[PDB]
Ligand binder design. Sequence first.
Ligand SMILES: *[C@@H]1O[C@H](CO)[C@@H](O)[C@H](O)[C@H]1NC(C)=O
Ligand SMILES: *[C@@H]1O[C@H](CO)[C@@H](O)[C@H](O)[C@H]1NC(C)=O
Ligand SMILES: *[C@@H]1O[C@H](CO)[C@@H](O)[C@H](O)[C@H]1NC(C)=O
Ligand SMILES: *[C@@H]1O[C@H](CO)[C@@H](O)[C@H](O)[C@H]1NC(C)=O
Ligand SMILES: *[C@@H]1O[C@H](CO)[C@@H](O)[C@H](O)[C@H]1NC(C)=O
Lengths: 121, 122, 115
Amino acid sequence: VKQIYKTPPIKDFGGFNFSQILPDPSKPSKRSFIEDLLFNKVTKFNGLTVLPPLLTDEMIAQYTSALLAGTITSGWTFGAGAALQIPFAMQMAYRFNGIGVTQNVLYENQKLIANQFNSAI
Amino acid sequence: SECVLGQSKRVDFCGKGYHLMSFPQSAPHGVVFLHVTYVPAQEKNFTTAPAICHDGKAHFPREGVFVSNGTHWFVTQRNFYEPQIITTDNTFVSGNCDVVIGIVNNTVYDPLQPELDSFKEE
Amino acid sequence: PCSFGGVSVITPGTNTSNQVAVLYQGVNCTEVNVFQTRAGCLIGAEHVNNSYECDIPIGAGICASYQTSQSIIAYTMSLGAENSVAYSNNSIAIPTNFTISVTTEILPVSMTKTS
Ligand SMILES: *[C@@H]1O[C@H](CO)[C@@H](O)[C@H](O)[C@H]1NC(C)=O
Ligand SMILES: *[C@@H]1O[C@H](CO)[C@@H](O)[C@H](O)[C@H]1NC(C)=O
Ligand SMILES: *[C@@H]1O[C@H](CO)[C@@H](O)[C@H](O)[C@H]1NC(C)=O
Ligand SMILES: *[C@@H]1O[C@H](CO)[C@@H](O)[C@H](O)[C@H]1NC(C)=O
Ligand SMILES: *[C@@H]1O[C@H](CO)[C@@H](O)[C@H](O)[C@H]1NC(C)=O
């Protein structure tokens, strides 16, 4: 990613829920619920010097949150060039048009799709 | 293969941007590709809409979305700004326009009716 | 066993100056301008609270640079400019003009057939 994107405080996306993968601002180390499940389910004087990484886990979380927010708000357009905003529902339509399904199938079944997505999450 | 002999869809694979084409050059022990992308700029902001209802029937655009020229609902494609007049051959019709959330109101111009109107004048 | 560590030197290129910066690995400064990191003891720099892009990585989000007298500074590295996009349910980003850029990419192919 070229630039950091922070999510808007608007959580209207056509019914889709992303509060389980966006960071909570309340944490000291800004991370999401699923990230916290991930980081908890992973468990000298001979010359052993354990060099730490250049990028700490907080920074990785910053980068991932930026990618995620750009995906949510800008489609794939920020992969190519400058980020171009778009609603999520229309982005979903775009992506269904990519796979041979017309976007009306989304716009008529939007709530069903959102509920399935939230359930899968 | 993917970027010299043809045009890959795979974004973020040969340069940054929508991939157009490339050129290879000789190099000691190596190769140097020269990728050509399509990076856009100079944007405006645009009020958008998912669909348009005209006579109870919805309209989904065949390609592109419905865009802003000011406070009007006109239409063009999704990666270059070139607005059009709403015609029948740019959209198609599937279902009533009442389940569609977020829809706006506009008239839909037809190409055939003014050519039909040339008949009923005479 | 009494404490030890790797000796590492931070510097710009010799075609700039000859000032240095001394980094002690994995042990803190109480046993050697003094600054402390999780990497250890860093001597010969100055802590700044401005965020730049990284020049030389050190560890634990710390990078050093040699800017304008002129001295060694270090800081907590950024991830570029903070930016966000105005989002609604009736907005989108559509372009009007464009450019045609060319990016150099280089991949190694072969090496010398030593025998
Ligand atoms: C108009 O476009 C600019 C360019 O990004 C954007 O910052 C601004 O929020 C847009 N206006 C509205 C009302 O969204
Ligand atoms: C967008 O959200 C606002 C919430 O203030 C709502 O009033 C409006 O009807 C929504 N418009 C669309 C097109 O979804
Ligand atoms: C590097 O050193 C040479 C000789 O000392 C000098 O001519 C050249 O200008 C230097 N490079 C820079 C960028 O100053
Ligand atoms: C060195 O050990 C820890 C790690 O930084 C530090 O908190 C402590 O204060 C240091 N020791 C002394 C004597 O200051
Ligand atoms: C560094 O932090 C201190 C407080 O810890 C603050 O007073 C100072 O202004 C900061 N330095 C810069 C360059 O902002």
